[PDB]
């Protein structure tokens, strides 16, 4: 993930499911975006055994928040290997239910 | 050789063998040698105690509130306070001395006497 | 008597002068390291100003 706390105290392996749980405005999206950005060097390696393709599912977020996340990924060059599946707050309950 | 003991009100300061013990009781200068007779005297207000050991330099001490007790076994010196030669600083020994307060001046004089410059 | 007093004051002078020399050496070491750190910080600050004016120009 590139985050010292996670990579040292709660390491994540490939194929694991690591929940990020917390109250609002605690940095959950920050941690996930940092992980996606950290995958940049692995992507540049070019070797599929090292490369990590990223999917970011946004459920129930306002469209401008998704735009901000995409902007952050652009800044770090992460959108070259990242796909965003967006079901913003205005979407029907069907899309919010199906996006994951 | 006789056992000297410099003991303060709070903590015993020193204890061990010695060959001679010089000090200044209110009566006058006194020197104690191993088998001195039992004695109880009061050190002078600005007293100094010099303990001559064997193979080591004389140990000089400035004493405030002194009381000497010689017994057939050991010699004891009681101090309200006491400072060794190493633990004494000339400057404060000077400003402290010549001060108006009687106890302050006496403590300064005792510290000076222990230093040697008197 | 004067020779003895000399010997004494000379020994005292050497004893304090060794310590004074060590203290002065440490002081100049600290001053030089502080100047080096200030140089590094000023270089970083100037670079930050450069990138900030670059941001302003690019935004305009």
């Amino acid at each position: 993930t590139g985050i010292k706390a996670i990579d040292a105290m709660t390491p994540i392996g490939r194929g694991q499911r690591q929940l990020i749980i917390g109250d609002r405005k605690t940095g959950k999206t920050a941690v996930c975006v940092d992980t996606i950005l950290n995958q940049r060097e692995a992507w540049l390696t070019g070797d599929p055994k090292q490369q990590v393709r990223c999917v970011y599912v946004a459920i129930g977020q306002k469209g401008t928040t998704i735009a901000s996340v995409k902007r952050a990924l652009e800044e770090g060059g992460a959108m070259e290997y990242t796909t965003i599946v967006a079901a913003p707050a205005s979407d029907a309950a069907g899309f919010k239910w199906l996006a994951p | 050789d006789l056992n000297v003991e410099i003991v303060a009100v709070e903590r015993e300061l020193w204890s061990g063998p010695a060959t001679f013990v010089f000090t200044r009781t209110t009566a006058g200068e006194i020197g104690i040698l191993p088998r001195h007779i039992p004695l109880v005297a009061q050190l002078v207000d600005d007293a100094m105690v010099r303990v001559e050991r064997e193979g080591e330099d004389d140990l000089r001490i400035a004493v405030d509130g002194g009381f000497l007790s010689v017994t057939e076994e050991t010699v004891r010196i009681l101090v309200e306070n006491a400072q060794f030669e190493s633990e004494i600083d000339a400057d404060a020994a000077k400003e402290d001395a010549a001060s108006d307060d009687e106890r302050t001046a006496a403590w300064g004089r005792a510290r000076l006497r222990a230093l040697g410059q008197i | 008597e004067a020779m003895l007093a000399k010997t004494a004051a000379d020994n005292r002078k050497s004893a304090e002068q060794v310590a004074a020399a060590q203290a002065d050496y440490e002081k100049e070491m600290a001053e030089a390291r502080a100047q080096a750190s200030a140089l590094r910080d000023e270089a970083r600050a100037a670079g930050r100003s450069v990138v900030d004016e670059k941001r302003a120009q690019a935004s305009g």
Binding site: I3, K4, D7, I20 | - | -
Partner: protein, 222 residues
């Protein structure tokens, strides 16, 4: 069947066998709790489903602990199997160090009353808490993380003031990458910290400490 919803979603994240190409998908579900009540229905279900949990807390965030991960309750059931050997070595002591630090933090003002071992533990814990702090949008490569954790857990931050640790760390990492990148190379290619690399790193750290200056101005050497 809401539990079934999330469980069938999250069981599709897996590490496939070599017969199926050995590919994998790692899941990072996010859950928003209310008033930090992790015993609510959906937090309970998702916690049950997943392999480990990173609990983020507002109190830690406001304390400057960012990312605000509560390492006391955060767990990873995979654990060391998901770390490289170097990180496994340097991160071995972190758990106990931080737990002892949280035990002792009530005695922060009473370091005189603490024996040498306890005061050393408290200081090391403060250093490590500062060490785990990270700015946003700044992922660290695994080798840089290994070097930083090495600094923290090998007593190389003891001589540094607490409030400086972060800067020191960052600066030192920039120093190595600029002049002693062979350490990072070694760590990355071998995924372990060799004895020679460790000695070179210690020497580099000490020289940098010579060059470093604390915020209060005092030297960090020895």
């Amino acid at each position: 069947d809401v539990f079934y919803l999330h469980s069938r979603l999250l069981e599709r994240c897996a590490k496939l066998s070599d017969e199926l190409g050995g590919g994998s998908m790692t899941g990072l579900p996010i859950i928003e709790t209310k008033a930090n009540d992790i015993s609510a229905f959906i937090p309970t279900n998702v916690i049950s489903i997943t392999d480990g949990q990173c609990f983020l807390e507002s109190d830690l965030f406001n304390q400057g602990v960012r990312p605000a991960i509560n390492v006391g309750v955060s767990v990873s059931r995979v654990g060391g199997a998901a770390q490289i050997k170097a990180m496994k070595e340097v991160a071995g002591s972190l758990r106990l160090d931080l737990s002892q630090y949280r035990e002792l933090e009530a005695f922060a003002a009473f370091a005189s009353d603490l024996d040498a071992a306890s005061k050393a533990q408290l200081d090391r814990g403060a250093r490590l808490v500062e060490l785990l702090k990270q700015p946003q949008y700044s992922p660290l490569a695994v080798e840089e993380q290994v070097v930083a954790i090495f600094l923290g857990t090998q007593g190389h931050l003891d001589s540094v003031p607490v409030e400086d640790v972060q800067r020191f760390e960052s600066e030192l990492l920039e120093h190595v990458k600029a002049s002693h990148s062979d350490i990072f190379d070694g760590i990355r290619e071998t995924k372990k910290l060799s004895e020679e690399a460790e000695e070179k790193l210690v020497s580099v750290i000490n020289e940098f400490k010579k060059g470093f200056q604390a915020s209060d101005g005092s030297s960090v050497v020895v």
